[PDB]
């Protein structure tokens, strides 16, 4: 929540893979399925781009009569309102009053698809170049 | 001291130092905001508009 920065990833070259693997360049047809959760470094022409659009990450609610806003986190592509108040005050209580939200105090990220295409000398003999999607945030 | 979750705004302390702005300016940004007769620059106005 209190997060000033954006922490990002680079793997390491060829040249200091044999100075004593990881970062292998690989094609689309060579992702077998058993390779999701592994670093890959994909090569490959970019047809399909898209907008860059403010995503949220947590929802801020605000209350009037406790004063204590809450935040929900957000992992799917869509969420549901939280109407019903979770304060450390409204559970002992009879008054369970209404909610509202933030649209600054909400942390939102520059998010944007692309579809990345195989290159044509990587493609097999006979085979057509399909494509992946890439889901960009930050900077 | 009253503080907004998320707001360093305070009520009373910013609506006593507006009322002081607001009671006493006569053209300070001629004099220091740059090297470039008057009297009540905002009261006037406020007691025009009525």
Redesign the interface.
């Known amino acids: 929540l209190t997060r000033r920065y954006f922490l990002y990833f680079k793997p390491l070259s060829q040249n200091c893979a044999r100075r004593y693997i990881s970062s292998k360049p690989l094609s689309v047809r060579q992702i077998k399925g058993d390779f999701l959760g592994q670093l890959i470094t994909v090569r490959g022409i970019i047809t399909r781009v898209s907008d860059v659009k403010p995503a949220v990450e947590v929802i801020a609610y605000?209350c009037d009569q406790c004063?204590?806003?809450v935040f929900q986190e957000v992992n799917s592509r869509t969420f549901t309102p939280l109407s019903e108040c979770t304060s450390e005050e409204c559970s002992q209580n009879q008054t369970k009053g209404q909610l509202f939200m933030?649209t600054?105090?909400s942390k939102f990220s520059a998010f944007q698809e692309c579809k990345i295409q195989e290159l044509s000398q990587q493609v097999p003999v006979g085979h057509i170049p399909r494509s992946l999607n890439i889901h960009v945030n930050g900077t | 001291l009253r503080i907004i979750w998320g707001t360093n705004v305070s009520i009373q302390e910013c609506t006593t130092n507006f009322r002081n702005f607001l009671m006493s300016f006569k053209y300070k940004f001629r004099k220091i905001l740059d090297e470039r007769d008057e009297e009540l620059y905002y009261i006037k106005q406020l007691n025009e508009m009525r």
């Open positions: 605000t004063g204590y806003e933030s600054r105090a």
